[PDB]
Amino acid sequence: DRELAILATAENLLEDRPLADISVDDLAKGAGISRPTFYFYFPSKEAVLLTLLDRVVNQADMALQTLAENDRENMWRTGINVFFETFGSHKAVTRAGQAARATSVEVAELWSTFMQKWIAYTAAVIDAERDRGAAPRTLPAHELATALNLMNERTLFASFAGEQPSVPEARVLDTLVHIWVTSIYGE
Amino acid sequence: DRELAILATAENLLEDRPLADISVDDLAKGAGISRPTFYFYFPSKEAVLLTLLDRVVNQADMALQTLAENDRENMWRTGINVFFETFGSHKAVTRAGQAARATSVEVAELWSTFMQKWIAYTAAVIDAERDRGAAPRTLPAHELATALNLMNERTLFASFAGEQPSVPEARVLDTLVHIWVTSIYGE
Ligand SMILES: COc1ccc2nc(-c3noc(C4CCN(C(=O)CCC(F)(F)F)CC4)n3)sc2c1
Numbered sequence: 001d002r003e004l005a006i007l008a009t010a011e012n013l014l015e016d017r018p019l020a021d022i023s024v025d026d027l028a029k030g031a032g033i034s035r036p037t038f039y040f041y042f043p044s045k046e047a048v049l050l051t052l053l054d055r056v057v058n059q060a061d062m063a064l065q066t067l068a069e070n071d072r073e074n075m076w077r078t079g080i081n082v083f084f085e086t087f088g089s090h091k092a093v094t095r096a097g098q099a100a101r102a103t104s105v106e107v108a109e110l111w112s113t114f115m116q117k118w119i120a121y122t123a124a125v126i127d128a129e130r131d132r133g134a135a136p137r138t139l140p141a142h143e144l145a146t147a148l149n150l151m152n153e154r155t156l157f158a159s160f161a162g163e164q165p166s167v168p169e170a171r172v173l174d175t176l177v178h179i180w181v182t183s184i185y186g187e
Numbered sequence: 188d189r190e191l192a193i194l195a196t197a198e199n200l201l202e203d204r205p206l207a208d209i210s211v212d213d214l215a216k217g218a219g220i221s222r223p224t225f226y227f228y229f230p231s232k233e234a235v236l237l238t239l240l241d242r243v244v245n246q247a248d249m250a251l252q253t254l255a256e257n258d259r260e261n262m263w264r265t266g267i268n269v270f271f272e273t274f275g276s277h278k279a280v281t282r283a284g285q286a287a288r289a290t291s292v293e294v295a296e297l298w299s300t301f302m303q304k305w306i307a308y309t310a311a312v313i314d315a316e317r318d319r320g321a322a323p324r325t326l327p328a329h330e331l332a333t334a335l336n337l338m339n340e341r342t343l344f345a346s347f348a349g350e351q352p353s354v355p356e357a358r359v360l361d362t363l364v365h366i367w368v369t370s371i372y373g374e
């Protein structure tokens with residue numbers, strides 16, 4: 001498709017510079033189409049990013065659903081690793097998509113929809129752990145799930161962007177898993 | 188000062204709308220000065236926000252220094268509460284300042300400088316807890332401190348903005364304290 005060519009070009013260019021510094025002409029050129037032909041597939045470069053982010057969050061979400069059809073530390077590590085690997089494989093899209101949350105209501109709403117879904121799935125697993133006697137009844141599961149998921153969002157994305165400060169990318173999985181296991185199973 | 192009047196006006200208007208929708212004329216008007224007189228004190232509305240954020244982060248930082256000159260759960264709760272109360276007392280400045288991290292290198296660098304300072308202070312306290320035998324030698328203190336501080340940044344600011352998703356503001360302190368105590372003292 002010309003559609004897939006535009007998406008691949010946008011992902012490539014986002015590795016070099018932000019969306020602000022990519023023109024519809026750059027996207028058309030890389031995709032081997034004219035400018036007006038671009039506007040047939042997407043109303044704006046912003047819509048291209050929204051589509052790229054939607055594919056990445058759906059890939060993470062489908063990978064977590066795959067896990068869910070089947071030791072406590074290794075379970076949480078495997079689950080966190082879906083997001084580490086999936087977002088970690090699409091750092092430029094992840095970075096540009098997180099920035100676009102501030103300027104695009106559609107990007108804000110996509111990110112918010114999936115965060116609510118992943119928080120609800122986390123809380124359901126914590127509740128099942130509590131029901132089976134593996135985890136103590138401490139905080140409300142949904143509030144614990146919210147903070148742990150927000151920690152992961154901020155910590156993954158700071159590490160991938162090499163922000164100062166950040167956990168080094170080679171330490172971020174062990175770091176998050178420790179905090180998830182001690183806070184879910186502790187006291 | 189006319190300076191203090193501009194800062195107070197900016198903090199007031201940021202409660203109603205974002206910086207983008209506040210003009211130098213609104214700031215001058217509220218401060219009882221002309222437009223050119225405004226430019227005597229500040230080069231831009233962006234500089235006004237940078238100054239407001241600098242005062243708020245310094246107030247938090249001075250309050251934490253005050254604590255530091257003197258049960259483990261209550262210690263961490265008191266320390267987290269400096270940020271909850273200080274930022275919670277300046278929600279409009281906090282919100283606009285966090286958004287400005289994306290568009291102002293000076294705002295990005297202020298926030299990054301103080302986060303490094305608070306992470307280093309957290310890690311020093313964790314290390315002292317380990318040295319005294321109160322906390323086990325688990326993760327590297329500085330990496331644990333980084334993730335817990337990033338959790339607090341994201342969780343406090345989502346709660347204050349009423350984002351979906353967020354921990355309710357009346358639950359956020361208990362939530363963060365649980366995760367800090369179990370991850371610092373656990374295993
Ligand atoms: C085969 O058996 C298994 C194996 C693994 C496994 N993991 C499970 C799980 N439940 O909830 C979560 C979170 C989703 C959000 N999550 C995130 O980190 C979200 C990151 C973000 F997108 F938020 F930034 C972290 C894991 N994982 S159930 C399960 C069953």
Ligand SMILES: COc1ccc2nc(-c3noc(C4CCN(C(=O)CCC(F)(F)F)CC4)n3)sc2c1
Pocket residue numbers: 251254255256257261262263265266267270302305306308309310312336337339340341343
């Ligand atoms: C009288 O005895 C006491 C009493 C309290 C007490 N608290 C201490 C402490 N050490 O590190 C921190 C963190 C700073 C960053 N922090 C944040 O939440 C930062 C929030 C952010 F700005 F990051 F968003 C959370 C507490 N607190 S030592 C101490 C000694």
